[PDB]
Amino acid sequence: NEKGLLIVLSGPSGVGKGTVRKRIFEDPSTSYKYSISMTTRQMREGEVDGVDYFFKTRDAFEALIKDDQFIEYAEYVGNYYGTPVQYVKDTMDEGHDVFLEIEVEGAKQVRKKFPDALFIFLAPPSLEHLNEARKEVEMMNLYDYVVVNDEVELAKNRIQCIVEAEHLKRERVEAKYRKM
Amino acid sequence: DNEKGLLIVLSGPSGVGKGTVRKRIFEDPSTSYKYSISMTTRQMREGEVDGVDYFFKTRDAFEALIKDDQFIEYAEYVGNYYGTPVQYVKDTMDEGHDVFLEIEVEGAKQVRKKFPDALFIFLAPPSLEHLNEARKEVEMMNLYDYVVVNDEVELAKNRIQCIVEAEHLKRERVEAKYRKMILEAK
Ligand SMILES: Nc1nc2c(ncn2[C@@H]2O[C@H](COP(=O)(O)OP(=O)(O)OP(=O)(O)O)[C@@H](OP(=O)(O)OP(=O)(O)O)[C@H]2O)c(=O)[nH]1
Ligand SMILES: [K+]
Ligand SMILES: [Mg+2]
């Protein structure tokens, strides 16, 4: 039906994707859901299970990998991080747009399962001020749109526009009227 | 090579208000696009100026221009010719400026044939949203990239502006700019 969009935000480490995502979620003009990732790293002071992350053992995470229960996962410095599939599918089926915040290479995994998801790459402003740039540009080929994080407000506006445009796409709007 | 401007095509059914939305778009000083001034054979109306609203032409001259392949597209609407002159569109895109067409649906089909990567926006009546007329309107949108409802002129303008902004952020376009920058530093 009118399933919600899957919106995938990534970019190089330290680019400020968390900060931009937080700005997007402060905007009252839209209402998004957020996929809380699973991790095998230890819970740190102040963190709460099912809020910051779902904290699991390495054996549990690997059992879930085996059962195809992640849209994407990766291992960083000995700890798994990944996106549980069921929350995403259920939330989209309820009509809600859902954001994933993932690391860059994970887009290939997501696209295999959700080829029509909206992939947004957040680029550092050092690209617009201009070797390391080659690596950053190489990362982009997995994504649909590129937004420079020059200022948090401007980046948020650009992303909101991209999402609004996605809701106006003909294939989506056409299907809605056809099915009616 | 040189980064070309986008070709933006606004169309949709008779009487949906393409003219009114286009007019509002070009009253906005933040609008970056260049408007393609069409040729027509219809009579000039009170308040219109030759070379602003349209380039007004005779049927003989318009038909000679058709024969010489001087239109990206032309159509007949209510017994008059309307068409988009070719050189202005090509020159303006080549200078890196986005170009905006406001045209009827038969013309838009011809543009798609020549510019398959142009941005096609279908302006829909709010009657479709409210609840045979609908089916025909849906068939008309098949070639289009986006659908914008003309519920309010200001709202339609804003949706269009966002669509064009989003297309400027497309990775293929952005990736090609950066790949070129990196290459020409060498
Ligand atoms: N193919 C083509 N069409 C053009 C071109 N220029 C203008 N048109 C269309 O020709 C139609 C008539 O234009 P106009 O003569 O200026 O008349 P209008 O202002 O539309 O009032 P009228 O139709 O007489 O009540 C419009 O479609 P609508 O009346 O449906 O628009 P809309 O959605 O705005 O109704 C225009 O979009 C062109 O270069 N090529
Ligand atoms: K026109
Ligand atoms: Mg009209």
Q: Break chain A into its structural domains and give their ranges.
A: 1-35+96-180, 36-95
Contact, A119 vs A7, CB < 8 A? no
How much distance in Å is there from the Cα of B13 to the middle of ligand 2?
14
Contact, A31 vs A166, CB < 8 A? no
Contact, A144 vs A119, CB < 8 A? yes
Show residues of chain B in contact with A134, CB under 8 Å.
182
Residue B111's contacts (CB-CB under 8 Å, 6 or more residues apart) are B7, B9, B72, B73, B84, B101, B103, B118, B120
Residue A29 DSSP code = T
Residue A57's contacts (CB-CB under 8 Å, 6 or more residues apart) are A40
Residues A22, B44: Cα–Cα separation, whole Å: 54
Beta-carbon-side half-sphere exposure of residue A113 (alpha carbons within 13 Å): 18
How much distance in Å is there from the Cα of B40 to the middle of ligand 2?
9
Architecture of the domain whose range is B1-36+97-186: 3-Layer(aba) Sandwich (3.40)
User: What tokens does A147 get?
Assistant: 């937004």
**Is B186 an 8 Å CB contact of chain A?**
no
List helix spans (H) across chain A: 17-26, 58-66, 85-93, 107-113, 126-129, 132-140, 152-167, 170-179
Biggest alpha carbon–alpha carbon distance for chain B: 60
B15 lines ligand 1 (CB under 6 A): yes
Nearest CA to ligand 1 atom 12: B77
User: What tokens does B92 get?
Assistant: 């303006």
Which string of DSSP letters, residue by residue, matches chain B?
-PPPPPEEEEE-STTS-HHHHHHHHHH-TT--PEE-PPEE-SPP-TT--BTTTBEE--HHHHHHHHHTT-EEEEEEETTEEEEEEHHHHHHHHHTT--EEEE--HHHHHHHHHH-TTSEEEEEE-HHHHH--HHHHHHHHTTT-SEEEE-SSHHHHHHHHHHHHHHHHTBHHHHHHHHHHHHHHT-
Residues B109, B144: Cα–Cα separation, whole Å: 10
Are domains B1-36+97-186 and B37-96 of this chain identical in fold? no
Pocket test for ligand 1, best of B73, B89, B104, B120 (most atoms within 8 A of CB): B104
List helix spans (H) across A5-148: 17-26, 58-66, 85-93, 107-113, 126-129, 132-140
Residues A162, A72: Cα–Cα separation, whole Å: 23
- The pairing of strands A79-84 and A70-76 is antiparallel
Residues A31, A179: Cα–Cα separation, whole Å: 25
Closest CA to A158 of A140, A176, A175, A145: A145
CATH number for the domain running over B37-96 = 3.30.63.10
CATH topology of domain A1-35+96-180: Rossmann fold (3.40.50)
User: What tokens does B186 get?
Assistant: 């060498």
Which string of DSSP letters, residue by residue, matches B151-164?
SSHHHHHHHHHHHH
B125 lines ligand 1 (CB under 6 A): no
**Is A173 an 8 Å CB contact of chain B?**
yes
Residues A127, A150: Cα–Cα separation, whole Å: 10
Amino acid at B100: F
Q: Starting from the edge strand earliest in sequence, which strands make up the sheet with A32-34, in order?
A: A32-34, A97-101, A6-10, A118-123, A145-148
User: What tokens does A140 get?
Assistant: 């982009």
CATH homologous superfamily of domain A36-95? Guanylate Kinase phosphate binding domain (3.30.63.10)
Note the residue count of chain A.
180
Contact, B116 vs B108, CB < 8 A? no
Judge residue A179's burial from the number of C-beta atoms within 10 Å of its C-beta, 0-12 exposed, 13-18 middle, 19 or more buried.
exposed
| The dihedral sign for the CA sequence A163, A167, A172, A176 | positive
Within chain A, how many helices (H) and strands (E) appear?
8, 9
Judge residue B103's burial from the number of C-beta atoms within 10 Å of its C-beta, 0-12 exposed, 13-18 middle, 19 or more buried.
buried
User: What tokens does A25 get?
Assistant: 């979620």
Residues A42, A60: Cα–Cα separation, whole Å: 14
Contact, B86 vs B71, CB < 8 A? yes
Note the residue count of chain B.
186
